[PDB]
Design a protein around this ligand. Structure first.
Ligand SMILES: [Cl-]
Length: 351
């Protein structure tokens, strides 16, 4: 008596079908006998019928700018039912690829934010945020905030609890990110939070003290930025580490041969700001370390102490600078995320 009815996730003649989800067909008042899908060059598209015969779905990634033809047939006590559908998928103007930090499988400090950097400007930040799923164990609240037009960050209100597992899924393939920009591919990554490592550089004492889970493990005399080019106060996130690097002021916009310029080859350099602040070996300022500031901003320490820092501090650990004559590190520096107040971070800037 009842005839089968066929329902698809697309309609005949549709355009702009997005490829961020499989295409599916479902039968009612009956079961699907067979479903086929082919592309505009005639090639079959891989699919699977559910065991109960009621639901069919594509099983392989669908492509941008293709035309697909779907043919389904179902059987019921009333009789048979058949339909054909043709539709076209999104045709992007541009592609953008996301790049996620930290690396897959890494162990990082309690200050490490999730970073998703696209290689193009993102017109629809809301769509980007919606395609990124952050899972945490233990679960903890967090929020997105854009540092510039290409890079978005995600972090909780306070530093991570040690031992937290973090899973990141950037599912932008098939997502319209605005102005015809679509994701080139998806990215999946996982990382773990390690020990709590907080080094405090106190200008009042000119000592850099490293505390691991509350325990003082190292005290390093330091020479920070001189009065005319002081080290900014605030919370710094540890980034990359270098056995040696040539610090070049022109990288930060200051000509080398200008009054505040510098080019210096140094050892055991740990970067803590995009603005150019490093902890590094400074044999020339050992006597000043612990007494007077002499740098253009870097935390100068002894060779042995700089190497200790390199060996025992990891990406995402924290350096806090206090009591300098400087201002405060900008929240959008690149490693200054924690200087943005939570109320402002949580409200976000997706526009
Ligand atoms: Cl083909």
């Amino acid at each position: 008596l009842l005839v089968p009815k066929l329902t698809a996730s697309v309609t005949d003649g549709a355009v702009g079908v997005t490829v961020d989800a499989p295409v599916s067909v479902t039968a009612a008042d009956g079961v699907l006998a067979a479903v086929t899908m082919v592309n505009d060059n005639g090639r079959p598209v891989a699919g699977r019928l559910s065991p109960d015969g009621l639901r069919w779905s594509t099983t392989e990634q669908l492509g941008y700018n293709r035309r697909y033809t779907l043919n389904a047939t179902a059987l019921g006590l009333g009789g048979a039912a058949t339909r054909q559908l043709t539709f076209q998928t999104s045709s992007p103007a541009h592609l953008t690829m996301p790049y996620v930090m930290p690396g897959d499988g890494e162990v990082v400090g309690v200050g490490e934010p999730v970073a998703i950097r696209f290689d193009e400007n993102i017109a629809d930040r809301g769509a980007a945020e919606k395609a990124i799923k952050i899972t945490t164990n233990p679960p903890v609240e967090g929020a997105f905030y854009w540092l510039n037009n290409r890079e978005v960050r995600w972090r909780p209100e306070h530093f991570w609890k040690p031992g937290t597992a973090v899973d990141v899924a950037v599912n932008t393939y098939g997502v319209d990110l605005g102005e015809g920009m679509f994701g080139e591919d998806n990215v999946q990554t996982h990382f773990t939070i390690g020990d709590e490592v907080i080094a405090t550089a106190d200008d009042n004492t000119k000592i850099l003290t490293v505390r691991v889970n509350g325990e003082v493990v190292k005290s390093m005399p330091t020479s920070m930025g001189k009065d005319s080019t002081p080290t900014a106060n605030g919370i710094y996130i540890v980034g990359s580490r270098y056995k040696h690097i040539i610090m070049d002021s022109s990288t930060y916009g200051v000509p080398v041969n200008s009054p505040n310029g510098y080019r210096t080859d140094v050892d055991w350099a740990t970067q803590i700001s995009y603005s150019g602040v490093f902890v590094h070996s400074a044999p020339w300022s050992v006597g000043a370390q612990g007494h007077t500031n002499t740098s253009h901003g870097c935390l100068n320490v002894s060779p042995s102490n700089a190497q200790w820092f390199y060996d025992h501090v990891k990406r995402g650990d924290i350096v806090e600078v206090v009591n300098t004559v400087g201002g405060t590190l900008p929240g959008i520096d690149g490693l200054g995320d924690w200087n943005i107040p939570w109320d402002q971070w949580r409200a976000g800037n997706a526009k």
